[PDB]
Design a protein around this ligand. Structure first.
Ligand SMILES: *Cc1c(COP(=O)(O)O)cnc(C)c1O
Ligand SMILES: *Cc1c(COP(=O)(O)O)cnc(C)c1O
Ligand SMILES: *Cc1c(COP(=O)(O)O)cnc(C)c1O
Ligand SMILES: *Cc1c(COP(=O)(O)O)cnc(C)c1O
Lengths: 455, 455, 463, 455
């Protein structure tokens, strides 16, 4: 019966006998080749403008990852040097965010797999601080709520997974984020804390912690209710410090007790890297820290994951070391330049409304636009997305949350390796698409599938 | 002024300015070299018998991991084929654990970073399942407890972070594990479930689910109280199915609603891979599952992390494809023969009483022993542990938990790579140590430091 | 009543097939073939048992990996050094090194364009070549004089073991000036005493293996000149510059030790020590044509005329010469100075810092004008700080560091020293880490008094 | 002014500033490329039929040699595993040559850089053995001699360096080797030993040690004088034990007290590896062995070299383990079948007389032939040799020593990698050279340069 043209031998079908555990062994390199070949069906992401996550390859990151394939992060004993490098990073990130100079030399924070993990960790201490304070006073502590904006999905999880009532201030037309006013309306003694999104996923815009900080101070005076903040700087955290160092959002704000960020977003780390830093020893409840015994003393951890590769910490460190402040500033500005240029060029092409023009002071390096209300140029942005996909380009169109469920937007993400010249290409394909849509009016209204929007 | 003999130029110390974010850029290949050089301080782990995790390099895994560096586990859209390989592995693991053949062709479960995340996930599902049952019966739900043996630390965490009373049945002399009787005294209507550890971290013994299962059956008959189980098969999950298949521990038992294991332990997968499988649709409360829109429809995920590499999943598949049931049976067998050899040989070298002798029907491939009571051979197992460390071997000695807190043990872990030849090297260095310790009596009692134990 | 499913043969977990032991029948020559990749993987796997040497502070030899050196070595795996015909370009490179090394040591300008000297495997080969050369030069001078040649002797200081061998193998009587407290080196006075009409030569060691100090050839050279005026005995030197040989000419070029001294007839050194050559490279250079007795040089025929060799080894790889040429070429005078300086800066820092932590007396504080980049110290006399240097070495080993504590020779058999060697790739950052581990160790020994005096094994001291 | 076309920079010449030590730095890659480029002027040896040494590249060997570039043979302490391997080899080789089973489980021998060092060692042991014995009898030990045959240059070296009178028995027409009768005549009380060369460099025939052994037995019966042997098995050492094991040449013969061989000749190791084995303990004088101290005991070495790579020993081991007896037999026979084929075919091409035709029982895989006396086919072997070179082939013609100064031979060496297909091509170029010389009668007797002949 069946032969394979690669091997010149009897066929082994990954798609049959994929319902059960395999019975027999297979020659090693044959297994390797079968799998390798089917990976060619994966995209490479170079033409993907939806994703936040690092997609550019650096030959040096590959080597570091490869050496670190078995280095256990949780094993501080066998891999003391990796452990050291980790602790360094914790500090360097702490510093980048203006955390108070730490007491003994070592800042209160931890590496994580991503911002998802950093956030629940952020959330758990937030809930714990609120709880303790609340038992102290002698009041019920069974109904905690969290106040926030158009948060990324992980916050919704935390909410459910931790039994916290989520008051997400709903998106609405010409009022897309958490403003002072609607925040204060959602706060009372049962609020564990307020979570501004420093770099909203859906739109790219910054939520500005400073106006929000003011309203929480006035709140305290008025009601004697003290409220903390946690900044989800999933992408913000490695942009602002460099391209807008005078946006005050970080630890410079006394209410911020912790900040998290994805290193594998604008932090230039490979996939698998996240950070969270607490203001000081006191932001982090001791009941959450578990001290594990090892050979030269005992290190306490607050983390969900246990064993895992230390590869990404080493990489993150390598980016940190090679670039520095000076170097990050050049990288991030390169991207803002591309975003900005795309924003200026895309306005010329249709009747668009910009939620985000890719400006260092308003948000991350991303262009995000919607069709001007009740204007009809002969196509939806879904339709336009589709023509562009026929050109290799993943540019997502979708609907926003809240009360702006109505609105369809397009969002372009300018990450590292999307240089000016590709930008150029995109625009040539972008125009080609308008022209084709123009010449075939029947193409209007047909596509309607929301794309992957969450990272 | 300071210079470096690698680079014959101005010194760049990573230990100076290691507390703040660096200002200036560095040549990319110097930064790489600086970090590469400092990783040689890390152990290669080949002589470490403390860890459970994979440390054997295989060129084909290295290659797969390297291709997979930017592949996003959470992005089913752009990496449609990794998405596929992940779904197969879920299926294949379900099968391995005797999951009821899945109704629509896809088993209920999910990849994870490790058992840590897989156990919380399972724990969460326990807590919700129980809640929903009490609510229905109109009863209070404020005091949930979990009943278990000498569990790996990850469970202490679960209890803490999710407000569950952990009834850890205490280790005691001649009574090291969770027995049916002590298990029953700890149970009540608030018990969200029982967790046997099918491969105890501290000693290597299996807690056999079957006797405990009987006890719960009798308990339900007596009280009306229906208690579920989740098996912590961290190591046991990829051992018994192959070398001891008629130990009845898995979904063959009606109460076991979910199983978890480490891919990076005896799963043979590289660091950062774990599995959890649920019996059927009803073991997973829907409220826990979050739906993400993409282009080809929408997928539901129950998972703490978000973005993270697909490398591991793919490597874990390669393992499955290349080995099969046949393959793994031989691989696990090889380990068991070594531990057995070691336990049989070591029993001759001193007054030792074994808690674990590395037999496939008792536990994982590990040797675990303590000094006989009232016998004094002229050294403690800490003393021996240090002599060994001088000849490169990491053979941990530590003390047990609960009421066994008195007991010092030494535990030798046998994993892939640790072949009979090396076990021979180890025996020689063992004997040489016993001899030096014998000629140098003064050394007795000096070392007293607990080694990293939890994995 | 059973539950397992087991196979009745030893299995390997790597290959999922029958076990094959390296330990069983490693006592006879193997009978059967094995799959190549399996043989490779078995051997490679048991090489992870070797140290990587990065925290070895005992050894002199080069241990830092450079990607370019790996590639030259790999290209040269089959390049036979002795085959001047097939590898003529390897042959010219080798010649270029000899010239360069002569220039570096102030050998008088070669009359025909080529210096007198040869590459070797290491200093060992070099010194015996040097010693045969010395022995023969003497021999001839005495038969001319019609005096007996059957009782030769050699006069030197605390030499490296290789001179003990030379002396044994070649029936030369060894007059080793013994070591002794506050006089650890072959001084003018004592040298003179051992010398008579049977002394083939004097061997000063430019950079001592045991401590790291230079014996300074100049003062010994003056003693010898004075010795000739008195007795009429004309005595030659050969300098064992095993490590000094690539240090001083860059960081202390006014220390006069080389061919600027007329009694120096040959110098040897190890390329794979401070030469920055990978393992397997040495050099001996002769002052000139007359320094090398014609009877030692064997003339081999090859296609483009005939070359003469003075070597113990024959067939062997040109990998190291090529690599050592690369070093020479990329670094140059400008560069070696920098590289070498870096290392001296590490020794100097280690010494200044280590002094602060206990009752030590330093034999060698790693200073460009006194010796190589090495710290050597002993415990002060009649002082007990609560450990011996042996014990400290053992706690230190427990953190990965191999820092040798051993006894010295001659009459300082009584004295125990610790010796740190700073070589390329042991940078200031590491030094730091060592220090932190050294303090830790002190603190551990302090809290554990019973530990004192138990350890007494000598470490490998010889390179 | 002057520029380099490779780097579009100022020229840097290696033939200029290569009279004195360079003054300046140079970029690391530029140096690399400069040297690397000139190495293409070196030949690859694939077409060189002069050399005995290993020239065939195997990918597995490259990798091991590259792992061991820093691994110090003399540093038993830092590289314990290499030390173990090195020792295994001494045993394996010992076994191979039928040494008596060693007392304490470790044969008396050592790895060397080559046969040359290996003979020097054997050499000194011979002189010492004789010195000791003669002192014991109260006799003069100032006039030692060595009896031997057409030795390789290392013995001429040994005789000079260590003041021994070399009594070489000279080759002469019709008798090219040390025979029993001329052996006996050169022997006396001052003979430190006899050295038969087990595979003569200049012709490829074996000197057969047995009928010499007889002569030494008969000699001792008559005179009372006892003479020992050392076999120079540079090449034959790793041929005979596989293709012709009942040639009695090794430790079977009681008077053999040491044997030496080149690994990098027929023992298949890369350049830089030799072996010398002693019959037992007593074969090796204790004054020759130096005892270094190290941390886990003390090892006595006997060797001229100190620090050097262990790369080749590890390589040599790899060749032993992967090939075994069965493998080597196959390997070497293939070399002989080429040799045997060349001899038969060359024969058909003109008026030659053979000294050696590549038979397993007479010598090594080598063809060696001279012109028939008083015949003139129209060229000298020197002239043939030159044409052969124009077609890329190194095939040495040269004269023999002593009394055969009159005889010019060609010697073809058949080593691993010179397979049947290349034999064929050689012939096709041999045939054409002969036709050219035929057509150009003027070329005759012009060339007259001896080739490198010594290995
Ligand atoms: C992408 C995103 C996340 C998810 O973070 P991961 O690193 O992908 O786990 C969380 N918060 C925000 C604001 C995001 O944009
Ligand atoms: C090691 C271990 C764990 C932790 O697993 P990771 O895969 O390292 O997250 C959990 N449970 C048990 C029983 C273990 O042995
Ligand atoms: C290292 C050393 C030697 C031996 O050199 P090798 O190249 O290792 O043979 C000789 N003399 C001195 C002074 C040494 O330090
Ligand atoms: C080449 C050769 C030698 C020399 O040994 P090397 O391995 O080249 O150092 C000695 N004897 C014979 C017969 C040889 O052919």
């Amino acid at each position: 019966e069946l032969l394979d043209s690669r091997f010149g031998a009897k066929s082994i079908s990954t798609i049959a006998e994929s319902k059960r555990f395999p019975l027999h062994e297979m020659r090693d390199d044959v297994a390797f080749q079968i799998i390798n070949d089917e990976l060619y069906l994966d995209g490479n992401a170079r033409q993907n403008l939806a994703t936040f996550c690092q997609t550019w390859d650096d030959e040096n990151v590959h080597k570091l990852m490869d050496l670190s394939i078995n280095k256990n992060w949780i094993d501080k004993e066998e891999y003391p040097q990796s452990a050291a490098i980790d602790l360094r990073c914790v500090n360097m990130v702490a510093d980048l965010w203006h955390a108070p100079a730490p007491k003994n030399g070592q800042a209160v924070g931890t590496n994580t797999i991503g911002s998802s993990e950093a956030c629940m960790l952020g959330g758990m201490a937030m809930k714990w601080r609120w709880r303790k304070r609340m038992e102290a006073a002698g009041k019920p502590t069974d109904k905690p709520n969290l106040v926030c904006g158009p948060v990324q999905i992980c916050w919704h999880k935390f909410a459910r997974y931790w039994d916290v009532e989520l008051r997400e201030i709903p998106m609405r037309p010409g009022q897309l984020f958490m403003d002072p006013k609607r925040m204060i309306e959602a706060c009372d003694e049962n609020t564990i804390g307020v979570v501004p999104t420093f770099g909203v996923t859906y739109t790219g815009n910054y939520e500005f912690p400073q106006p929000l900080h003011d309203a929480l101070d006035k709140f305290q005076a008025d009601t004697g209710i003290d409220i903390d903040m946690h900044i989800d700087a999933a992408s913000g955290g490695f942009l602002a410090p460099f391209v807008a160092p005078d946006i005050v959002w970080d630890f410079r704000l006394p209410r911020v007790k912790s900040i998290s960020a994805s290193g594998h977003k604008f932090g230039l780390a490979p996939l698998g890297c996240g950070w969270v830093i607490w203001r000081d020893e006191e932001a982090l409840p001791q009941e959450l820290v578990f001290n594990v015994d090892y050979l030269g003393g005992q290190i306490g951890t607050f983390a969900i994951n246990f064993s895992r590769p230390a590869g990404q910490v080493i990489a993150q460190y390598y980016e940190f070391l090679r670039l520095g402040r000076e170097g990050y500033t050049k990288v991030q500005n390169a991207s803002y330049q591309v975003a900005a240029y795309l924003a200026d060029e895309i306005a010329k092409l249709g009747p668009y409304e910009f939620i985000c023009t890719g400006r260092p002071d308003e948000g991350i390096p991303a262009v995000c636009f919607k069709l001007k209300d009740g204007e009809d140029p002969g196509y939806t942005l879904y339709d336009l997305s589709e023509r562009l996909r026929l050109r290799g380009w993943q540019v997502p169109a979708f609907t926003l949350g809240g009360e702006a469920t109505d609105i369809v937007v397009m969002r372009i993400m300018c990450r590292r390796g999307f240089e000016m010249d590709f930008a150029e290409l995109l625009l040539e394909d972008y125009k080609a698409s308008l022209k084709y849509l123009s010449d075939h009016p029947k193409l209007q209204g047909i596509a309607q599938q929301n794309s992957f929007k969450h990272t």
